[PDB]
Design a protein around this ligand. Structure first.
Ligand code: NA
Ligand code: NA
Lengths: 359, 359, 359, 359
């Protein structure tokens, strides 16, 4: 007894209440049921907006929003060339908006629409980056006081100096805090493969929650060398926009955490399927939630994270007063956990007037 | 703005309006929102009913029906020993009922709840089994007249005689009908592996839609021998109740169609994830719909089949007048296609009074 | 000069002399030669009994008990759907009873019928589970005093706390007792695969006899990661009911001990063949003997364990006075060893009157 | 209630009632229960007899015959060097005799002791060898008239001429007899691997029951080349005496029929386990029964062949009147099938007086 949901208009609002350009996609329908979605391309806000305004919107107006995957498949192949940061982001904002419409139509929280909760809340990790161990302590202790139990620690913001200081960082952190928290670290592709394998063996004893981006970006074939000699947990996927980047990685158990950005791989639609894939292959899920993701994206990740069986942790995003003003009711971690929204829909929208104040 | 959905009661109704014992699971809730699900174990109707009545129902009463996967995971591990025909069927009827409740709560067709249609309808295949080619012609032509374009053909209802007659069947069917329809065939595990490989090479030229169960049941390792020499399309999975039976099969591209029964693998919850898995690995989907599946199961398969990207075809089930009476509004193929129900929920229930007439 | 042995009746007696529902299957024959077998499904006693009473017994009455594997193959495929906890248990009680009849007919101990002893007795392991190291010491020392040389030790009856305490348990046990006994530990599938590999490397130095269930249940593919980096001995198979669960595991040397329950995989008939398979591939055998296995099952495991070349150890089961009363002559470990029965048959039966006292 | 069975004496009788030296091993016991076994080494009758007389018999006298595998393992490693034609044959005669004793003790047919029949009888194949097609027809038609449905056909008793004539033989046989019988062929290792692969592809269309010994004897690695391009069924194992010869062959599905001689691999004890192994891996069983196997060996193969699930066919052995005289009650094929003996024991012994007449 759901009737066709006809797409009447599409907007793409960029706003700068804080450090970053924030991109919201707005899908309006004849019923006056409105959907909101998040795109995130700060280095390139304008490319995304053009892609939505005069390429996505023409092929969407008039369409039945009810059939989300149909509309997904159609957008994804429309330019013929496909898979990249600009297109997937644009499509992801619409995909998210379509899911939002469906959940409002269903009168339910987005994660309930998916099928319900696997857990009550998702743990959160924060970022401690400093040039000195003193600075990292200062930051760690403040996060501890707030209930966080996972913290990404980066000492220093040549390759040998970085590897040496980082092992010293892991060593001092275990000496000072033992097992009070899990320690995450992103290598940011700074190592040659031989250096990567060496570092994986040396850092193993310190039991990182995961080491992210330990290899240069098209050298994943070197993972088998690492995984045959080290038990170190590994995350990859942050810059992926293309299934070829994650398919063999996961089928071959070459990583422990997938770290894709939901908007970079095309939205909720592909995120659910990749979530199920991860569960099949025993890989955990830690989607990125960067500084320029809006409270709308973050709310979507929390819905994903209480629903998907293999979701492990959500990445923290601050929000200043401006941002909370532009996106009302944006949840914040309580004792180190993010709670899914409980009203119908995504549960967070953008205040268009407020977003005006901040062009 | 969905509130807890509290499970108030659970029933398991068996009925014999026709050839088979039909098993319906009924989940009632405080809101008076009622869910219906299908279990199918004709050789063993009673085992399923005991499993539901005094093992499932105790651990379910009081629970929040909203969290379907939570309740799935819990039922699946509850007996500690797990995965088999009796338990998965029992759990599948409840799983299906929980999905039904959620879709009614959402005021939407079950497949809309999933995320919408990938296609308008799913094609249907029928069964032509006879002891003589004359009998098979007679049956094929009646199906053709009704718009069917896929037909499973079985000539004869020793191994060498069966292999010889079957190749003769494929050969005569192509001579008589050319490409007017797709031809399916189930080998039913009747061949030794060496005979299987020989038959796969010989039948290739006749281009079956798929050959089902070509190997003895724990000899899937012989598939690589077949797939390195023959292009014949292969289906397996009919008797699977255990992920170990399908995980390596699909990851290694050893089959072309998965043929599991949705109720044997535990319900809609695992069916969606296996559907996504099949899409990832390029394997198509043809769930079994046996003679003792009710119109409730069949309606669920059609919802699955218009929604999941890789769904290929639905297996036909007759329904006599009795059965239509016990389960009102059960769809029937139109010009060789089954159309998903469009009212809220699964769209088919059981008339409890009518089911009374047929114990 | 053996004549047909005609099956005249079949019973399934459940009894609760102690903690658990105990299930005995009884096969009677025209000659008045009676067989006894054990089914074990405590979470689900009733499902098994229904399966025996009105599904197994009809297809068995009149049949020639002499042809055990014929009757095995026939029961196993009879429901068409196959392999699960309820059916295999039911079939296993009958299979065991058929073997019992044959051994009485032969006037010999069951293990002699198989072909004789490989060893004089099988060692036994016991269970020390407590919340504190003090409690585990207390329990270990009592087992030591009784001659046991293998003990499964469980400290605590989050994942990080469990892994930490368990390594502390292994470490304190080696410090206190050195090599006075072998230490077994069941991880019970509580770890993610990355945590499993880490734990396997860390626990290696303490030389467990085996670590059981170290992975989540459908993640055995992660075993190669473990086995390429750690020498830790591994057991799996406790919940298996399906050859697909053990075939590739053993052929690829992915475990060191098979831990299936003889009743869950269908009886003595499949146990002998899996025993031979284990010998071929260099895998040792440690069938489960849970708290609800009867003295009849236990006697069968001891016959299996003195006969099969690769049998390594038998799991201990208590028996209170009630149980000994219901099943007379049930052997008990002497100086840490179980001795096979030496009278004709299995050597243990059920006292039907006594089983009456305890419904 | 079986008591120790004490070995009192051991004999090895050679006899030449026909073409071949026939070797029977005799195990006597204090109870006066006597066992008979078959060794077959015609090229070397005397080596076997020495091995039994003054190496086996000393380590056997006094021993408990009840524990067959214990005594097997002990004999097999006794010389320290192990596995070859002379030792395994000697040990096989004793192993067979020990099984014979056990079956008489049990008052049952040997195959009943094993666990019963899988089938009522085993089909038989015969040998048609001639230098001309006329000669092969003559022979085939006589076998057909007698009810045989499987015949090994050899045309000619250089490599290119042999390959050419053999394909011509297969072609003419299909033209003349179509599918009236199965056609077996032994290549006898006469081909280089490249010629083997070519022949396997060319002979495929004629559907041999199997092609035996298609490769030179230590070139089994070339099997993967064949099996990736041809469906031709393959048998190997005739000269095997060493598990290394069959273990990887079967685990990797590189053959379809195992063709070992039971006496060459050490007796019934290893034959049962290899039978179970074959079943696991989907390989069928066709033990050799050469012209110098006695009616005692043949009776043992028939017991093996009605019992083991994967047994496919038994090789024919004539017996002239002399031989029937030396070994009374030796079964003969009826309408192309051999029937297992139904009296207690193996069911065939040697008449020592009669064997006297024929030194
Ligand atoms: Na290694
Ligand atoms: Na090929």
């Amino acid at each position: 007894s759901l009737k066709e949901t006809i797409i009447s208009d599409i907007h793409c609002i960029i706003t700068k209440p804080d450090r970053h350009n924030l991109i919201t996609v707005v899908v309006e329908t004849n019923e006056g049921v409105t959907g909101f979605g998040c795109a995130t391309f700060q280095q390139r806000p304008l490319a995304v907006k053009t892609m939505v305004d005069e390429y996505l919107k023409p092929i969407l107006i008039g369409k039945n929003a009810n059939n989300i995957e149909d509309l997904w498949q159609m957008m994804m192949v429309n330019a013929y060339w496909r898979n990249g940061p600009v297109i997937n982001n644009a499509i992801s904002g619409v995909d998210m908006a379509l899911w939002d419409i469906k959940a409002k139509l269903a009168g339910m929280p987005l994660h309930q629409l998916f099928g319900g909760k696997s857990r009550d809340a998702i743990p959160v990790y924060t970022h401690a980056t400093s040039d000195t161990m003193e600075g990292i302590y200062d930051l760690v202790e403040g996060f501890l006081e707030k209930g966080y139990k996972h913290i990404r620690c980066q000492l220093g913001f040549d390759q040998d100096q970085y590897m040496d200081n980082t092992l010293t960082m892991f060593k001092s952190l275990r000496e000072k805090y033992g097992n009070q928290f899990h320690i995450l670290h992103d290598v940011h592709e700074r190592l040659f493969p031989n250096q990567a394998i060496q570092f994986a063996k040396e850092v193993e004893q310190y039991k990182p929650y995961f080491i992210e981006d330990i290899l240069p970006p098209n050298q994943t074939e070197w993972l088998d060398n690492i995984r045959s000699q080290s038990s170190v947990s590994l995350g990859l996927g942050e810059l992926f926009n293309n299934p070829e980047e994650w398919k063999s990685l996961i089928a071959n158990r070459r990583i422990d955490f997938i770290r894709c950005h939901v908007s970079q791989i095309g939205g909720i639609t592909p995120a659910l399927k990749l979530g199920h894939l991860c569960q099949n292959f025993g890989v955990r899920i830690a989607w990125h939630c960067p500084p320029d993701m809006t409270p709308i994206g973050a709310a979507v990740n929390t819905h994903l994270n209480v629903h998907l069986h293999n979701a492990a942790i959500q990445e923290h995003v601050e929000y200043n007063g401006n941002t909370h003003k532009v996106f009302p009711n944006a949840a914040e971690p309580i004792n180190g956990y993010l709670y899914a929204s409980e009203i119908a829909g995504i549960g967070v929208e953008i205040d268009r007037e407020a977003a005006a104040e901040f062009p």
